Design an enzyme around this catalytic site. Structure first.
Site, PDB file in Angstrom:
ATOM      1  CG  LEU A 136       8.691  12.931  -1.977  1.00  0.00           C
ATOM      2  CD1 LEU A 136       8.300  14.312  -2.394  1.00  0.00           C
ATOM      3  CD2 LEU A 136       7.770  12.434  -0.893  1.00  0.00           C
ATOM      4  CD  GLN A 188       0.100  18.378  -0.210  1.00  0.00           C
ATOM      5  OE1 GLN A 188      -0.837  18.717   0.515  1.00  0.00           O
ATOM      6  NE2 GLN A 188       1.138  17.647   0.233  1.00  0.00           N
ATOM      7  CB  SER A 234      -0.919   0.016   1.220  1.00  0.00           C
ATOM      8  OG  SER A 234      -1.655  -1.187   1.342  1.00  0.00           O
ATOM      9  CB  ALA A 264       6.019   5.444  -0.770  1.00  0.00           C
ATOM     10  NE  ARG A 303      -1.043  15.692   2.648  1.00  0.00           N
ATOM     11  CZ  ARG A 303       0.194  15.353   3.006  1.00  0.00           C
ATOM     12  NH1 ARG A 303       0.504  15.167   4.289  1.00  0.00           N
ATOM     13  NH2 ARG A 303       1.138  15.199   2.076  1.00  0.00           N
ATOM     14  CG  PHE A 332       7.900  17.494   7.663  1.00  0.00           C
ATOM     15  CD1 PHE A 332       9.100  17.240   8.308  1.00  0.00           C
ATOM     16  CD2 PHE A 332       7.736  17.059   6.360  1.00  0.00           C
ATOM     17  CE1 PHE A 332      10.119  16.568   7.670  1.00  0.00           C
ATOM     18  CE2 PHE A 332       8.753  16.378   5.709  1.00  0.00           C
ATOM     19  CZ  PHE A 332       9.949  16.132   6.365  1.00  0.00           C
ATOM     20  CG  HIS A 337       2.866  14.480  -2.712  1.00  0.00           C
ATOM     21  ND1 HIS A 337       3.892  13.564  -2.656  1.00  0.00           N
ATOM     22  CD2 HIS A 337       2.413  14.616  -1.443  1.00  0.00           C
ATOM     23  CE1 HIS A 337       4.053  13.160  -1.411  1.00  0.00           C
ATOM     24  NE2 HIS A 337       3.165  13.780  -0.655  1.00  0.00           N
ATOM     25  CG  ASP A 339      -9.316   1.223  -8.264  1.00  0.00           C
ATOM     26  OD1 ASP A 339      -8.932   2.142  -9.009  1.00  0.00           O
ATOM     27  OD2 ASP A 339      -8.702   0.137  -8.179  1.00  0.00           O
ATOM     28  NE  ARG A 350       1.903  21.619  -0.094  1.00  0.00           N
ATOM     29  CZ  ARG A 350       1.848  20.597   0.759  1.00  0.00           C
ATOM     30  NH1 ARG A 350       2.807  19.658   0.770  1.00  0.00           N
ATOM     31  NH2 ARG A 350       0.839  20.525   1.616  1.00  0.00           N
ATOM     32  CD  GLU A 364       8.509  20.535   4.051  1.00  0.00           C
ATOM     33  OE1 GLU A 364       7.488  19.863   3.781  1.00  0.00           O
ATOM     34  OE2 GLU A 364       8.464  21.574   4.742  1.00  0.00           O
ATOM     35  N   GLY A 404       1.634  19.428   5.633  1.00  0.00           N
ATOM     36  CA  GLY A 404       2.689  18.417   5.602  1.00  0.00           C
ATOM     37  C   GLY A 404       2.782  17.613   6.894  1.00  0.00           C
ATOM     38  CB  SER A 405       3.981  15.715   8.875  1.00  0.00           C
ATOM     39  OG  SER A 405       3.598  16.760   9.758  1.00  0.00           O
ATOM     40  CG  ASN A 406      -1.842  17.522   9.776  1.00  0.00           C
ATOM     41  OD1 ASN A 406      -1.263  17.196  10.809  1.00  0.00           O
ATOM     42  ND2 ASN A 406      -2.587  18.618   9.693  1.00  0.00           N
ATOM     43  CG  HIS A 440       6.613  17.197  -2.500  1.00  0.00           C
ATOM     44  ND1 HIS A 440       7.909  17.664  -2.591  1.00  0.00           N
ATOM     45  CD2 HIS A 440       6.439  16.816  -1.212  1.00  0.00           C
ATOM     46  CE1 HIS A 440       8.492  17.570  -1.408  1.00  0.00           C
ATOM     47  NE2 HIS A 440       7.621  17.057  -0.555  1.00  0.00           N
ATOM     48  CD  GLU A 456      -3.780  10.393  -0.675  1.00  0.00           C
ATOM     49  OE1 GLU A 456      -2.960   9.591  -0.190  1.00  0.00           O
ATOM     50  OE2 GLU A 456      -3.496  11.145  -1.631  1.00  0.00           O
TER      51      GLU A 456
END
Ligand code: FAD
Ligand code: OAA
Ligand code: SF4
Ligand code: F3S
Ligand code: FES
Lengths: 130, 577, 243, 119
Positions: free
Chosen positions: B243, B231, B44, B48, B391, B117, B356, B212, B288, B246, B393-395, B233, B380
């Protein structure tokens, strides 16, 4: 009645000849054969040594055979390979952490190798100098 | 088909899904839980992530600071009663993760270290090296094995969900290896299918991310919310879109142009900060949005370097030195070395702003429940109301574990007091899903699924990028409509049953197309510039709380047309000016 | 500048049609950037849509690209065409049954991995209490072994798993070792069952090839050996129990 | 599934000996193959240092008695253990190998232990 036929590849008794890594592993494992051979040779020695001057002098004659010398020369290189390899692998059994980092293996590999050298000398010194 | 009995079914085995699966097996030890994923859970996309997970930990911090950082971060398109819930349940969830054996990186005193972040003032991003996502998911997945109550349908592709009388009753899914259809009858269903970044040509996402789950929601008259917010990056490798964290810019790395000028100072992000000292919110640690935008501005000037893979800017990390490099950012080194062939100590790295994250998603209420009773969306693929227009970052990882917990808990309640649906009506639903599938298989027209795909990516990247005009948005809406037609002329040549990818990638493409049209229309309609949605045309260049302080809701009707509705944004403690 | 073209041998298999796997040849245009994965895409996209393979992350972090390139376990997305100018052959991941094309049966792996109880055990702490305390030094013990992405390359590489498919395997043993050496875990005793088994650590002759192939530089061989030391401790400490 | 309740392998004992035998042989085997294998038979050594008389003198002494034992015994347990799995590695099937090799090792061990107590 699944539509799948899972195809299993056979494994030949010669799987090792293909990759050079496997070859080395095999050859490294193969160091045992001479390593055992030497131990046999030492039993002969030990035994003929108990049976007085006659047997022992005939045993030293056995080692004096041109082929047996060649065989022993191979036996030395064999056990030398074993040592070299063995030392590369022994450290991987140790899990020591120094200053928040997993240590090894060079410190061990060197340590061990040194001990081999100090032994080699001490033994050659003991055996030959007196 | 083969019918399975389950007390609840979860689609997806990412962070969200797994946290849900675990939560539900704890909330009720006796229930049977069906966990479904089209890849083995560990694959999943959650796997990453590098940057980390946000949760309040430092003594000078407060939940209010993390609240205000998020709401302002989403340009007040946040459902504030959701943010308040979110912030407060973060420290519990990250702690619980640590307890399950997540290898969080630590202060020498043995307590967990944090870093900063998404321009947050007070540092609250918990991190396991640079592989936070791999660790979270692998800990979450490994943890879940201890609960027998979770029965896993690994490598099962969910086709549709089963709905009757406004209540969910289960789902149909293909067994990917056998190629055989399966009914899972669950009286509550959770959607953990993750984002839909893949509809863009150049993106940071893994293959699985085809959207899907969103597509299935669309099909049952469930709206997708805030879809135009995609979003980007700032720093992704060119042509792969891979990626660069950051972390790179957080360790004081620099972005320069063909002249090697640290250009970010000219875009409202002056003054230049000395290499050693990287101040937050200034230059490479700037906001960002502006950073991504800065690339576009530089691109039109002929300042951007030209490479075979694309026009790039340089992420120079040379000045970082190998000591902190390999300790803090080691994985980044490997990628650069392999994927762009750049040694990050000797050479500069080509980076291009890249698609991203999907702020958009399946409309849910504060319990993660949809307009359809029993149907939940988490992570997501959902739109809980947390991220609003952009969003933080890191949330995102945090969301997974916080709401994954809630969704698992909430679905257990719903399924336990659901009662029984109309058996004849339900089975007849599955018949349709089966027939609808067959209809696709037979479909003839000699159209390659891949070329339609390739084209959809291009339309999105050109029409729904960082800067958006009406013409190009329209062009994209047009192109998508064309591609929708061409999709009906696709012919799937592989008719095999055993792990047929051709068929599956084509299904995925279908959802892709529907969802893209949601993003595209939503964008065209929102006549303002808020968060990720930036319009250049006259009168839409600024934010509009007057006319556009509302959520974009995109429905797909049976006739195949994308109709929009609008919904209010709930406020608690922090209104805008 | 027209891209260089490359002949690629890809071993196909369809259970419905094929009696046994047979090679097939595909000509793919490539540049310095093109990863085998990239190329594998082109195939399905342009030449053989009927091709089936496993992929996703694209950055060698998910672990699904497990396949053999020229008799070497590799990741499809970390394998680069420029490196195979002399020639290139792609069969599915070794030591696993081939279900279809480049997809293999991974069940045994999953089962093994599961059997070693890889989760924090016996820790009675709770979330409201605060996180456990663990030093950088305490992490160092297992940390490297925790980085396994489950590609299964170790299994294709290890000859002992070839000869013995009941051997629980390098990856699965490593993961057990990882939880053992984690200070937070008090379930060591639960895992030793599987580890002490003939199909556990003791099926390993230290060929060490698993570590060479590991994409994530985990060095499972070390886990297995520290495992052997640990199992032996338990064998002794078990024999010395009169009780 | 996989076997929930697997037998504890009895291998640790044999691997243990192999571990010590490997370690002994590693360090002290090379020099010895030189002494007994090359130096002695070729006469490449000073005077009466490896002459019958002097060897006997050393072998009979307790220190020597122990040394000769280990130098013969330990390399066997290491070596034969390695060969046992080599049979399996070559896919060659040998009946009760477990008993054969470790038997041979025990046999020789005994023969050695007898030798060092004078025959
Ligand atoms: C490179 C990268 C780095 C990131 N780093 C961070 C970070 O540092 N911090 C942070 O907070 N966020 C980060 N994010 C964002 C964040 O990781 C994601 O938003 C989050 O992981 C989404 O997880 P999820 O549970 O929603 O679903 P995913 O992890 O995307 O998993 C989706 C699941 O749904 C299943 N699925 C999909 N379609 C189907 C179907 N048709 N049938 C059956 N199953 C299906 C899939 O198999 C899979 O199991 C990052 C994202 C990327 C791309
Ligand atoms: O964008 C984010 O939320 C965090 C991320 O992927 C990074 O590490 O840069
Ligand atoms: S140890 Fe390395 S090879 Fe083996 S699965 Fe894990 S990551 Fe893959
Ligand atoms: S290759 Fe196999 S034999 Fe042991 S060292 Fe690795 S598990
Ligand atoms: S694609 Fe994810 S491992 Fe290579």
């Amino acid at each position: 009645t699944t539509k799948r036929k899972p195809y299993v590849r056979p494994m030949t008794s010669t799987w090792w000849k293909k990759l050079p890594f496997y070859r080395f592993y095999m050859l490294r494992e193969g160091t045992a054969v001479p390593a055992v051979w030497f131990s046999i040779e030492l039993i002969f020695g030990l035994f003929a040594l108990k049976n007085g001057p006659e047997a022992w002098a005939g045993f030293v004659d056995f080692l004096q055979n041109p082929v047996i010398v060649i065989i022993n020369l191979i036996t030395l290189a064999a056990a030398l390979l074993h040592t070299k390899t063995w030392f590369e692998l022994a450290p991987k059994a140790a899990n020591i952490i120094v200053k928040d980092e997993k240590m090894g293996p060079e410190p061990i590999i060197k340590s061990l190798w040194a001990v081999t050298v100090v032994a080699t000398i001490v033994i050659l010194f003991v055996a030959l100098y007196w | 088909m083969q019918t399975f009995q389950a007390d609840l079914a979860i689609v997806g085995a990412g962070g969200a899904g797994l946290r849900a699966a675990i939560a539900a097996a704890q909330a009720n030890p006796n229930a049977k839980i069906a966990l479904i994923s089209k890849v083995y859970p560990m694959r999943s996309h959650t796997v990453a992530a590098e940057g980390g997970s946000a949760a309040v930990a430092q003594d000078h911090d407060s939940f209010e600071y993390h609240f205000h950082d998020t709401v302002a971060g989403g340009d007040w398109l946040c459902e504030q009663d959701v943010v308040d819930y979110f912030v407060h349940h973060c420290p519990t969830e990250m702690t619980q993760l640590e307890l399950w054996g997540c290898p969080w990186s630590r202060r020498p005193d043995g307590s967990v270290n944090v870093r900063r972040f998404g321009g947050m003032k007070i540092e609250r991003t918990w991190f396991a090296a640079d592989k936070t996502g791999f660790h979270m998911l692998h800990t979450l997945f490994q943890t879940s094995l201890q609960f027998p109550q979770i029965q896993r349908f690994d490598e099962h592709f969910v086709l549709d969900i089963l709905v009757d009388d406004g209540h969910v009753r289960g789902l149909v899914a293909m067994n990917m290896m056998e190629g055989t259809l399966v009914q899972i009858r669950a009286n509550a269903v959770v959607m953990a299918t993750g984002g839909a970044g893949r509809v863009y040509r150049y993106n940071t996402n893994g293959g699985i991310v085809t959207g899907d789950g969103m597509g299935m929601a669309l099909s049952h008259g469930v709206p997708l919310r805030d879809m135009e917010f995609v979003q980007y990056h700032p720093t992704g490798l060119p042509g792969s879109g891979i990626l660069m964290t950051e972390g790179c810019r957080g360790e004081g790395g620099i972005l320069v142009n063909k002249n090697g000028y640290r250009y970010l100072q000219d875009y409202g992000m002056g003054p230049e900060t000395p290499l050693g000292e990287p101040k937050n919110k200034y230059m490479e640690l700037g906001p960002r949005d502006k950073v991504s935008q800065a690339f576009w501005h530089e691109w039109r000037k002929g300042n951007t370097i030209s490479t075979p893979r694309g026009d790039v800017v340089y992420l120079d990390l040379r000045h970082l030195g190998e000591k902190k490099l390999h300790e803090r950012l080691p994985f980044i080194c490997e990628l650069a070395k392999a994927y762009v062939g750049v040694d990050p100590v000797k050479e500069p790295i080509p980076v291009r702003p890249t698609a991203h994250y999907t702020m958009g998603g399946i409309e849910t209420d504060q319990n993660c429940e949809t307009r359809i009773k029993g149907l939940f969306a988490v992570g997501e693929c959902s739109s809980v109301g947390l991220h609003g227009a952009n969003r933080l970052g890191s949330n995102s990882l945090a969301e997974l574990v916080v709401f994954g917990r809630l969704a698992g808990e909430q679905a257990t309640e719903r399924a336990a007091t659901a009662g029984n649906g109309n058996e004849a009506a339900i089975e007849a639903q599955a018949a349709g899903v089966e027939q609808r599938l067959k209809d696709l298989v037979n479909q003839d027209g000699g159209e390659n699924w891949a070329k339609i795909r390739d084209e959809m990516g291009l339309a999105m990247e050109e029409g729904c990028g960082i800067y958006r005009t009406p013409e190009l948005m329209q062009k994209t809406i047009d192109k998508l409509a064309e591609l929708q037609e061409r999709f009906k002329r696709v012919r799937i040549t592989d008719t095999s049953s055993v792990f047929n990818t051709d068929l599956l990638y084509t299904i995925e493409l279908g959802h892709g197309l529907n969802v893209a049209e949601c993003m595209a229309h939503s964008a065209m309609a929102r006549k303002e510039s808020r968060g990720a949605h930036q319009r250049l045309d006259e009168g839409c260049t600024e934010r509009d709380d007057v006319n556009f302080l509302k959520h974009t809701l995109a429905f797909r009707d049976a006739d195949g047309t994308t109709r929009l509705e609008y919904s209010d944004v709930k406020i608690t403690t922090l209104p805008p000016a | 500048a027209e891209m260089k073209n490359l002949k690629i041998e890809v071993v196909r298999y369809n259970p419905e049609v094929d009696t046994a796997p047979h090679s097939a040849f595909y000509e793919v245009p490539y540049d310095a950037t093109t990863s085998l994965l990239d190329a594998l895409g082109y195939i399905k996209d342009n030449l053989a849509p009927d091709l089936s393979y496993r992929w996703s992350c694209r950055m060698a972090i998910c672990g699904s690209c497990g396949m053999m390139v020229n008799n070497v376990p590799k990741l499809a997305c970390k394998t680069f065409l420029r490196d195979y100018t002399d020639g290139m052959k792609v069969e599915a991941l070794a030591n696993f049954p081939i279900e279809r094309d480049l997809v293999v049966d991974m069940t045994h792996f999953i089962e093994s991995l599961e059997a070693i109880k890889p989760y924090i055990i016996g820790n009675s702490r709770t979330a409201d209490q605060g996180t456990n305390i663990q030093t950088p030094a305490q992490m160092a013990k297992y940390h490297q072994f925790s980085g396994c992405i489950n590609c299964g390359l170790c299994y294709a590489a290890c000859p002992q798993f070839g000869l013995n498919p009941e051997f629980i395997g390098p990856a699965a043993i490593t993961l057990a070792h990882r939880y053992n050496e984690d200070s937070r875990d008090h379930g060591k005793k639960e895992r030793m069952a599987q580890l002490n088994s003939q199909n556990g650590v003791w099926s390993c002759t230290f060929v060490g090839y698993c570590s060479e192939v590991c994409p994530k530089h985990v060095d499972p061989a070390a886990a297995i050996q520290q495992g052997k030391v640990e199992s032996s401790k338990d064998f002794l400490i078990a024999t010395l129990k009169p009780r | 599934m996989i076997n929930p309740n697997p037998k504890r392998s009895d291998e640790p004992v044999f691997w243990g000996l192999f571990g010590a035998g490997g370690m002994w042989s590693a360090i002290i085997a090379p020099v010895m193959i030189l002494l007994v294998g090359i130096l002695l038979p070729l006469g490449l050594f000073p005077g009466d240092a490896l002459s019958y008389e002097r060897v006997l003198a050393f072998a009979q002494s307790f220190i020597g008695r122990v040394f000769l034992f280990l130098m013969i015994v330990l390399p066997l347990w290491c070596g034969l253990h390695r060969m046992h799995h080599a049979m399996h590695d070559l896919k060659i099937h040998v009946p009760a190998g477990k008993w054969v090799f470790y038997g041979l090792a025990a046999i020789l061990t005994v023969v050695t232990l007898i030798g060092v107590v004078t025959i």
